[PDB]
A = this chain, B = another copy of it.
């Protein structure tokens, strides 16, 4: 099975790529930093003995995205699983202080990118035989309830839910499944913004609990392990003790 994980050189993406590789998949990963990507491909293929190709790619750029998918096709002929994971955040700055440059950055990375990757996945999954495949979109807890000072991130994540639905709907008759995982506070280490301090509903900065990245990878492996006729349309996996379920 062929898998493509955008933003798979670092963090959650990497742990997903790693777990996917251990399960047998051939895995392509994308990122913008060749050293990081090269490194991760080497370590993961290292451990698993299975194929790991690294393509440097800006998913906001349509030519680069188109090139990425033409390379994947040229080497593997088909694509069985796409994990749309590339993203980014804005500093928690006041809403009216977000620069145009920051705004464009997050729309491209968090929404446009996931959209261009879906298009190319559709074109490949429709054409290949057997037809079909799965697309899993990395969402966020921000697809449900915002932190203060997070309009852009919160918009782009909400937009991903929309994308997931339309994709789930348009792909139905084509044996293409689409599902979304909303992630709550997954972190490799205390270097992450959750341990470093994130805004609470009252506008204060505080540290929040996190969950090992390993659990998310596990979850995604389960979503992808399903036959095309089953689908995890949405799932929320989170640090249990982080604020979310109460009023803020």
Q: What sequence of 0s and 1s flags, for each residue 193-237 of chain A, a beta carbon within 8 Å of any chain B beta carbon? A: 000000011110000010110010011001001101111111111
User: A162 — nearest CB in chain B belongs to which residue?
Assistant: B158
User: Chain B interface: which of A10-18, A72-80, A165-173?
Assistant: A165-173
Asked if A115 lies at the interface with its beta carbon under 8 angstroms from chain B, I say yes
The 8 Å CB contact of A155, one of B111, B150, B234, is: B111
Cβ contacts under 8 Å, A225 to chain B = 218
* Contact, CB under 8 Å: B231 / A238: yes
Which residues of the other chain, B, contact A169 by a CB distance below 8 angstroms? 146, 148, 201, 245-246, 248
Contact B155 A203 (CB under 8 A): no
A85 at the interface (CB under 8 A from B): no
CA distance A112 to B155 in the complex (A): 10
Contact of A95 among B150, B156, B170, B219 (CB under 8 A): B170
- Please classify how large the interface on chain A is, using the bins under 10, 10 to 19, 20 to 34, 35 or more: 35 or more
Known: A201-B248, A222-B222, A234-B235. A151 touches B162 (CB 8 A): yes
Q: Is the CB of A155 within 8 A of B160?
A: yes
Q: Nearest chain B CB to A189's CB is how many angstroms away?
A: 13
Q: Per a CB cutoff under 8 Å, which of B162, B241, B243 touches A247?
A: B243
Residue of B nearest to A132 (CB): B240
Contact of A100 among B62, B239, B247 (CB under 8 A): B62
Q: Mask for A109-134, Cβ within 8 A of B = 1, else 0? A: 00110011011101100100000000
Enumerate chain A interface residues (CB-CB to B < 8 A): 62, 94-96, 98, 100, 103, 107, 111-112, 115-116, 118-120, 122-123, 126, 142-143, 145-152, 154-163, 165-170, 172-173, 175, 177, 184, 200-203, 209, 211-212, 215, 218-219, 222, 225-226, 228-248
A-B pairs, top 5 by smallest CB distance, nearest first, are A246-B248, A201-B246, A158-B162, A235-B235, A151-B166
